[PDB]
Amino acid sequence: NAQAEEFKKYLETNGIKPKQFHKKELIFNQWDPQEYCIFLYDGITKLTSISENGTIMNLQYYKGAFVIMSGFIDTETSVGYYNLEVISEQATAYVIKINELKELLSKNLTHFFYVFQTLQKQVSYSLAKFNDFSINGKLGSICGQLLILTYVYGKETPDGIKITLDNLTMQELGSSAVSRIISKLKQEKVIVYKNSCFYVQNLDYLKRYAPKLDEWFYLACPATWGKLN
Amino acid sequence: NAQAEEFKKYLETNGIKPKQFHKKELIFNQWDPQEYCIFLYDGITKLTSISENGTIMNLQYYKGAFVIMSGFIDTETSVGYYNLEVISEQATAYVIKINELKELLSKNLTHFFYVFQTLQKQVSYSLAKFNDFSINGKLGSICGQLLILTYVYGKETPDGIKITLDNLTMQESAVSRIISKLKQEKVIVYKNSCFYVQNLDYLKRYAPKLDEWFYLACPATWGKLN
Amino acid sequence: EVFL
Amino acid sequence: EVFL
Numbered sequence: 001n002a003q004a005e006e007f008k009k010y011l012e013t014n015g016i017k018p019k020q021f022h023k024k025e026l027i028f029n030q031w032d033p034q035e036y037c038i039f040l041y042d043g044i045t046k047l048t049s050i051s052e053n054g055t056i057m058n059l060q061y062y063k064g065a066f067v068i069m070s071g072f073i074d075t076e077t078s079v080g081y082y083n084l085e086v087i088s089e090q091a092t093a094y095v096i097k098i099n100e101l102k103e104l105l106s107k108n109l110t111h112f113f114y115v116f117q118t119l120q121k122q123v124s125y126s127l128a129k130f131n132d133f134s135i136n137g138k139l140g141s142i143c144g145q146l147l148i149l150t151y152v153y154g155k156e157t158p159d160g161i162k163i164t165l166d167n168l169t170m171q172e173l174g175s176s177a178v179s180r181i182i183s184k185l186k187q188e189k190v191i192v193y194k195n196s197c198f199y200v201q202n203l204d205y206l207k208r209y210a211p212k213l214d215e216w217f218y219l220a221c222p223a224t225w226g227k228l229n
Numbered sequence: 230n231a232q233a234e235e236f237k238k239y240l241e242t243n244g245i246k247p248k249q250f251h252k253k254e255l256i257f258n259q260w261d262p263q264e265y266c267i268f269l270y271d272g273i274t275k276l277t278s279i280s281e282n283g284t285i286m287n288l289q290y291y292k293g294a295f296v297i298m299s300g301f302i303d304t305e306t307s308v309g310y311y312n313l314e315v316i317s318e319q320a321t322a323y324v325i326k327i328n329e330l331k332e333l334l335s336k337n338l339t340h341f342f343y344v345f346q347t348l349q350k351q352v353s354y355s356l357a358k359f360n361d362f363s364i365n366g367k368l369g370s371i372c373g374q375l376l377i378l379t380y381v382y383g384k385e386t387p388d389g390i391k392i393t394l395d396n397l398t399m400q401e402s403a404v405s406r407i408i409s410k411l412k413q414e415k416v417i418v419y420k421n422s423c424f425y426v427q428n429l430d431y432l433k434r435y436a437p438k439l440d441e442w443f444y445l446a447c448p449a450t451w452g453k454l455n
Numbered sequence: 456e457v458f459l
Numbered sequence: 460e461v462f463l
Contacts, residue, residue, distance in 0.1 A: 049438065051364060106338040109331075113331075116345060131288055291456075450456065
């Protein structure tokens with residue numbers, strides 16, 4: 001990316017340092033009263049929540065570059081008791097206290113806008129995904145998720161668009177009724193599970209059944225959307 | 230709400246004036262080439278999208294004071310082909326073109342933060358809804374929705390907390406069956422065309438994360454029944 | 456506020 | 460970016 005790298009160098013000019021994490025570590029946790037702004041620069045993470053039993057539920061996955069905040073930018077209070085867990089083997093993240101970012105973001109507007117429109121990408125992402133469910137149910141939800149992963153991670157290959165994610169990573173990505181659905185979707189040759197990776201053969205099928213997540217990605221990341229379209 | 234009041238004053242201060250909106254009018258639509266930042270000061274609205282076929286899908290509702298922006302603040306392109314339809318009898322809203330908002334934001338940051346944090350509530354709201362649903366299946370989602378409605382529209386009454394939204398919006402397979410459970414369980418009561426609640430803590434038990442979210446995002450309104 |  |  002371009003604007004993420006310019007946000008990186010802006011943070012480094014002002015003295016914010018990158019921290020490195022390894023799988024399973026928490027960049028922030030739901031018990032820390034200090035709330036943070038994480039500029040995830042490289043790696044894959046996931047937002048989790050722990051219930052009364054103590055089981056972990058995964059709510060959202062984020063790849064670098066992206067911004068994740070544990071608190072409201074002004075109140076500094078929790079937006080939800082959530083943990084940000086690393087799942088990629090290693091991750092690079094800039095951890096900024098919620099207090100300081102307001103002063104950093106004020107000095108430069110273009111980098112404010114950058115954080116602003118990352119929230120917009122998340123808001124619109126959630127609305128798009130709800131929508132595709134409201135139209136096609138879990139078929140729309142699963143095709144939508146496969147379409148995003150294809151766009152972000154695809155490499156065209158003889159067999160299909162390989163979703164070049166790490167074996168361990170895709171396994172945990174995909175309580176097993178969805179896998180059952182996958183075997184149904186597989187039979188109609190939209191996807192093939194080959195070389196220990198998913199290969200998409202009919203992207204148009206996914207786009208037709210998950211249209212608003214396809215629209216979302218086009219409006220939110222047209223350059224990425226353009227390579228496979 | 231002092232903070233919402235502040236925003237309303239600040240935009241006027243700079244030369245922007247409120248617009249009134251009758252029910253069914255669109256403050257913006259999905260075919261407009263121009264994107265807008267809407268500061269919905271009063272009234273109720275819904276976001277909608279229209280499919281190829283032409284079917285309307287309701288995606289979310291907004292009560293004032295709130296901010297809805299149809300374009301990315303930087304690129305000025307659509308965040309999604311959505312319409313903002315008034316469903317209350319009337320609504321007052323300030324309609325700002327997305328290219329003009331950055332000039333006001335070029336001046337001050339305090340206000341800019343107020344809008345930033347409204348997005349955060351939106352983000353956490355969707356995360357809260359996913360969590361409850363995943364934990365308590367469809368029972369959690371509807372009780373989640375009833376509890377939010379109970380927090381914003383809930384009126385203490387001897388029969389029970391009345392969800393003070395008329396039949397128009399209250400009526401707006403599985404859902405019918407789950408609701409029958411709720412009424413059978415004496416958690417909810419349906420008299421005079423709108424639901425009443427007598428086991429608020431039952432809704433709270435099966436939508437706990439959503440209850441957490443209202444507490445953290447709208448801590449005054451939460452106080453009303455806790 | 457938000458809902459639904 | 461965001462996914463799932």
